[PDB]
Structure formats: structure tokens, C-alpha cells
């Protein structure tokens, strides 16, 4: 830990991320073939001959049809939800999950994780430079609650203020500007040592990486990026950042008595393009999302 400008911190973080991605692309010498089967319901028996650690379930959807690319939000690699731009590794079986499936719980969780990550990206780059803004983590609140949340610790000078409606609308406008540019949710699986060396600064992120690499015997934590923002998240994410259609930030709340310092919780609600609600229903959801949600035990 030393003195570093946030801009140079982002540049060095991106450089390390790209170097790791390059070495992951490079340790495989030649193009290898995988026979990924389609265990879905609409196009059964379809096998794709894809490239190892190069091609993606979005590429499989491109082979199938354009509707698959448009509607498929998650993949299922033999048991598990994969984000749409994660290169495939072994000869597997695949199934595409959309927002209107019978059991869309996995895609709901992934969509809310993505929305929380976008909200954190908007928050980190919307405050004065001489305040220290640090992201603690995004609690894995359930969709049945009113909103997704992000925990942020601000510098000591801002332990007495509260953002007003204009500032909240500014946060929503930043979120919509982020939505307007189609940014893929790039993914990466790295080792614990590399994960620590990318961040190297925030003790909150350090303990987050420790907690996320302890339960894995291989000490691997997932890493995701939109544009030049990099966050640590649990579980996969949605392919594109324009999937969200309605996006807002509702309010921010404090939880002081659990720590000498102050941790704020930003809350927000979003609805995808496939599931847009009417003006009145969206107003109802907006009004509910302003309530504090406490699901951490």
C-alpha cells in the first residue's frame, strides 16, 4: 500500500488484468476441438465443434440462430450457470436459460449481481477525488426483496451528509449512460496470489478475496470487468450491460453500530428489456425499493 492516483490505479489494474488474460490465452499452444452437445428442448441433438478456451456459449448461440443470441441470458455447462462470454474448456453439454424460463432463479440472481456491479461502478466514479471512496462488497440479497445493494465506505469527512433527490437522479443518469454503451461483462478465473496482486490496496477487497478463495481448494476467485471497471463477484453475470431497460437508485442507508467507522448501503432496482413493466407498476417498485433490506444472516 502506497500513494496512488485513482486514474493510474485503474490503468495498472487494467494492465494486470490484460496480462493475465493474455497468459491464459497463451498457455494453450494450438486450437483444440470440443464436442459441446445441446441438451436443450428446442434443438435437441445439435453438437457444436468449438475451440478450446476460445469460443463461448454466445458463439454456440450464433451458430444456432439470432433468437438464441438475443434471448439467452445464461448457459448451463453440464450442471452450472456460465456467463455468456466465458470460454468453454471441456467437451460438455449445454442449455440456454432465458428470463422467461420455468425456473429463472439463476438468471435472476445473475442479473441482480450484474445490476449491483453496474451501480458500484457508477458510485466509485461519481464522488470528489479528495474523498476516499471504497467498495466493501455487494450483499447477495434475494430478488424477492425490494432492491439490490452495494456497501461503500466513504472518507471520514462524509460521515454526516446525505445525498438528496437530485444526487440520486444523477446516479441514475450515470447508470443509464453506462447502459447506453454496449459493454460486455468480461469474465476471468485467476489464482489467489494474482487476485491479491491486482488489487493490493483495499483491505476490504483483500478480505473479500480471502473469503472467496478459502472454500475453493484451488484458491480461485472469479473476476469481472465492464469497460475499465473491475469488481470481484460471486456467480456469473449477464452478457451485455444494455440488457437492463429500467434502472434506478432509490436511497442509501447507514449501519453504524457494527463498526467504529461508517458503512453506507446504496440500493437500486432494475428491470430487463424482456420484462419491462408499465409506468405505474415501475412506480410501485420504485417506491418499495427505497426501504432498507437486511438479509445477511
Partner 1 sequence: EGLIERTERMKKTMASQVSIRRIKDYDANFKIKDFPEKAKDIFIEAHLCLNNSDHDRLHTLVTEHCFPDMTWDIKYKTVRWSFVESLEPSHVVQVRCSSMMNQGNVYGQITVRMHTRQTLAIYDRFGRLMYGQEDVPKDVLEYVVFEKQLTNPYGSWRMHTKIVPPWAPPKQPILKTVMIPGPQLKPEEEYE
Partner 2 sequence: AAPKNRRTIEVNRCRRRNPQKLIKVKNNIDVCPECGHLKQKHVLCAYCYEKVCKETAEIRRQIGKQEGGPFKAPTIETVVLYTGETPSEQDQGKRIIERDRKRPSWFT
Partner 3 sequence: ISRKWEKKNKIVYPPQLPGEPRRPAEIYHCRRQIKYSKDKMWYLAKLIRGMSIDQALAQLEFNDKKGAKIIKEVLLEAQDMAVRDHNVEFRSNLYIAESTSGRGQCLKRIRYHGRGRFGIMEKVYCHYFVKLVEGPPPPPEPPKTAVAHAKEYIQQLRSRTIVHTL
Applying CB under 8 A, which residues contact partner 1?
30-33, 38, 43-51, 55, 59, 63-64
- Minimum Å gap between C-beta 48 and partner 1 is 5
Q: What does 50 interact with, of partner 1, partner 2, partner 3, none (CB < 5 to 8 A by kind)?
A: partner 1
Residues 18-47 that bind partner 2 (CB under 8 A): 41-43
Q: What does 69 interact with, of partner 2, partner 1, partner 3, none (CB < 5 to 8 A by kind)?
A: partner 3
How many Å apart are CA 85 and CA 54, to the nearest integer?
10
How many Å apart are CA 190 and CA 183, to the nearest integer?
21
Beta bridge partners of 269: 248
Among 36, 64, 153, 269, binds partner 3 (CB under 8 A): 64
Judged by CB under 8 A, does residue 71 bind partner 2? yes
Judged by CB under 8 A, does residue 47 bind partner 3? no
Judged by CB under 8 A, does residue 52 bind partner 2? no
- Minimum Å gap between C-beta 164 and partner 2 is 40
Judged by CB under 8 A, does residue 276 bind partner 2? no
Judged by CB under 8 A, does residue 291 bind partner 2? no
Interface with partner 2 (CB under 8 A), residue total 6
- Minimum Å gap between C-beta 67 and partner 2 is 5
CB atoms within 10 A of CB 293: 19
Nine cell digits for residue 232: 470481484
Among 22, 62, 273, 281, binds partner 3 (CB under 8 A): 62
Q: What does 100 interact with, of partner 1, partner 2, partner 3, none (CB < 5 to 8 A by kind)?
A: partner 2
Q: What does 71 interact with, of partner 2, partner 1, partner 3, none (CB < 5 to 8 A by kind)?
A: partner 2
How many Å apart are CA 282 and CA 293, to the nearest integer?
19
Closer to partner 2 by CB, 71 or 125: give it: 71
Judged by CB under 8 A, does residue 273 bind partner 2? no
- Minimum Å gap between C-beta 35 and partner 3 is 16
3-state DSSP of the chain: CCCCCHHHHHHHHHHHHHHHHHHHHHCCCCCCEEEEEECCCCCCCCEEEEECCCCCHHHHHHHHCHHHHHHCCEEEECCEEECCCCCCCCCCEECEECCCCCCCHHHHHHHHHHHHHHHHHHHHCCCCCCCCCEEEECCCCCCCCCCEEEEEECCHHHCCCCCCHHHHHHHHHHHHHHHHCCCECEEEEEEHHHHHHHHCCCHHHHHHHHHHHHCCCCCEEEEEEECCEEECCCCCCCCECCCEEEEEEEEEEECCCCCCCCCEEEEEEEEECCCCCCHHHHHHHHHHHCCCCCCCC
Closer to partner 3 by CB, 22 or 62: give it: 62
Closer to partner 2 by CB, 71 or 201: give it: 71
Residues 99-138 that bind partner 2 (CB under 8 A): 100
Interacting residue ranges for partner 2, rule: CB under 8 A:
41-43, 67, 71, 100
Amino acid at each position: 500500500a502506497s500513494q496512488l492516483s485513482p486514474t493510474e490505479l485503474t490503468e495498472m489494474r487494467n494492465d494486470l488484468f490484460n496480462k493475465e488474460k493474455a497468459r491464459q490465452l497463451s498457455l494453450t499452444p494450438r486450437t483444440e476441438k470440443i464436442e459441446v452437445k445441446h441438451v436443450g428442448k428446442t434443438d435437441p441433438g445439435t453438437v457444436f465443434v468449438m475451440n478450446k478456451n476460445i469460443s463461448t456459449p454466445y458463439s454456440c448461440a450464433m451458430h444456432l440462430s439470432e433468437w438464441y443470441c438475443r434471448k439467452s441470458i445464461l448457459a448451463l455447462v453440464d450442471g452450472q450457470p456460465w456467463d455468456m462470454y466465458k470460454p468453454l474448456t471441456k467437451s460438455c453439454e449445454i442449455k440456454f436459460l432465458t428470463f422467461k424460463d420455468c425456473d429463472p432463479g439463476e438468471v435472476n440472481k445473475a442479473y441482480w449481481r450484474s445490476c449491483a456491479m453496474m451501480m458500484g461502478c457508477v458510485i466509485e466514479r461519481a464522488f470528489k477525488d479528495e474523498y476516499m471512496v471504497n467498495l466493501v462488497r455487494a450483499p447477495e440479497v434475494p430478488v424477492i426483496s425490494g432492491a439490490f445493494c452495494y456497501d461503500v465506505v466513504l472518507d471520514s469527512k462524509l460521515d454526516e451528509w446525505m445525498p438528496t433527490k437530485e444526487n440520486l437522479r444523477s446516479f441514475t443518469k450515470d447508470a443509464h449512460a453506462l447502459i447506453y454503451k454496449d459493454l460486455p461483462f468480461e469474465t476471468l478465473e485467476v489464482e489467489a496470489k494474482v487476485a491479491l496482486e491486482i488489487f493490493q490496496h483495499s483491505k476490504y477487497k483483500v478480505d473479500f478475496i480471502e473469503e472467496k478463495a478459502s472454500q475453493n481448494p484451488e484458491r480461485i476467485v472469479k473476476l469481472h470487468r465492464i469497460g475499465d471497471f473491475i469488481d470481484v463477484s460471486e456467480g456469473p453475470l449477464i452478457p451485455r450491460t444494455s440488457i437492463c431497460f429500467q434502472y434506478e437508485v432509490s436511497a442509501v442507508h447507514n449501519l453504524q453500530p457494527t463498526q467504529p467507522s461508517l458503512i453506507r448501503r446504496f440500493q437500486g432496482v432494475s428491470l430487463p428489456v424482456h420484462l419491462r413493466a408499465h409506468f405505474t407498476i415501475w412506480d410501485k417498485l420504485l417506491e418499495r425499493s427505497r426501504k432498507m433490506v437486511t438479509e445477511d444472516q
